[PDB]
Amino acid sequence: MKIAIINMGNNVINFKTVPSSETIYLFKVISEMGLNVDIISLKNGVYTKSFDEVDVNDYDRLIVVNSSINFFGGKPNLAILSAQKFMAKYKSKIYYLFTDIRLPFSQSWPNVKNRPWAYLYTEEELLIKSPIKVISQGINLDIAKAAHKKVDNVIEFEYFPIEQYKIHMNDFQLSKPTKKTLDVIYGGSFRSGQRESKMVEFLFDTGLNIEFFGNAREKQFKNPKYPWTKAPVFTGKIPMNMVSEKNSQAIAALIIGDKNYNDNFITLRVWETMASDAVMLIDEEFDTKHRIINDARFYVNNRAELIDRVNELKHSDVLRKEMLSIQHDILNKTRAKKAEWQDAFKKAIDL
Ligand SMILES: O=c1ccn([C@@H]2O[C@H](COP(=O)(O)OP(=O)(O)O)[C@@H](O)[C@H]2O)c(=O)[nH]1
Ligand SMILES: [Mg+2]
Ligand SMILES: [Mg+2]
């Protein structure tokens, strides 16, 4: 029994990049389940074996982490091409880990054929024909299916909370009390504006000391539908393995998501935030039933309520520590279900 896990569109080496980090973390959580797993990437490394040195059909299961397959500048991207070539030769079912609604499985050949460098690859080499099982982070399978409406071989769909992987690591640990330097914090990309309204509502013109880290930059917020006067401070990107420590610098950390994420996705940030020393404040619309934490104090409906809640935490250290204790307790209640989680994952990949 040998399992192979690959990232469909990014090179995997270490924790210097987010997609590489995510693949390594998934590799780790699967391995810790008592399974033999290899990460296959462009070259052999501390965490990987090269695509060329192995033979895909020697593996009993092929797991693929979702990614975009867009070629920038219309130039070749070996991570994408080699991953799909690897997938194309596999003769069994492919398990696609669908954690980002915007990254559904897609065929690269259709884009390659019209390229001047098309002569470098053949349809036979890149067209993936094996049946595929999409393992959806989102519970709503129709949304997942709508996202894959163009593919002809994506046959199955099954929900599984993939991004709980950070809390189930053998080396997982809650963040410790941290000196506060910010009132509110949020880390992420601009996600092509798929969440601009919420970002402006909760992070702009608040009068609070707010920091926005990650790939997002102030100049990206220019939609006339969502005006603002004073923006939060944009500090740049940090390694994925440092996100909880970063969140911990603030009194509170914001939870928001894409339209299709509301009452559907429980993203990685939910856990990175819950496990941090920052009080988790959730956009009401993101979890209307309060399923993450059955305590309305952790939820905010708009800018005004966010401002009120944050001030409350600033004027009462005891309230802040109470809420942190509660989210830490809730996080642990989910960790106590690791066995179930592991068995659910194994079943998801037909083991
Ligand atoms: O500087 C940063 C900012 C974000 N992240 C990671 O990127 C995720 C955010 O991804 P995205 O912006 O797509 O938001 P999501 O849709 O995950 O909420 C975080 O949870 C982190 O794991 C990171 O590693 N470094
Ligand atoms: Mg994610
Ligand atoms: Mg309220």
From Swiss-Prot:
Pathway assigned in UniProt: Genetic information processing; DNA modification
Single GO term (MF): DNA beta-glucosyltransferase activity
EC number in record: 2.4.1.27
EC class name: transferase
InterPro entries xref list: Phage_Bgt
GO biological process: DNA modification; symbiont-mediated evasion of host restriction-modification system; symbiont-mediated suppression of host innate immune response
Keywords linked to the UniProt accession: Glycosyltransferase, Host-virus interaction, Inhibition of host innate immune response by virus, Restriction-modification system evasion by virus, Transferase, Viral immunoevasion
Catalytic activity: Transfers a beta-D-glucosyl residue from UDP-alpha-D-glucose to a hydroxymethylcytosine residue in DNA
Superkingdom in the source lineage: Viruses
Role according to the record: Catalyzes the transfer of glucose from uridine diphosphoglucose to 5-hydroxymethyl cytosine of T4 DNA to yield glucosyl 5-hydroxymethyl cytosine (glc-HMC). This DNA process seems to occur immediately after DNA synthesis since the DNA alpha-glucosyltransferase interacts with the clamp protein gp45. The glc-HMC modification protects the phage genome against its own nucleases and the host restriction endonuclease system. The glc-HMC modification also protects against the host CRISPR-Cas9 defense system.
Subunit and partners: Monomer.
Name this polypeptide is given: DNA beta-glucosyltransferase
Organism for this UniProt entry: Enterobacteria phage T4
Taxon lineage: Viruses, Duplodnaviria, Heunggongvirae, Uroviricota, Caudoviricetes
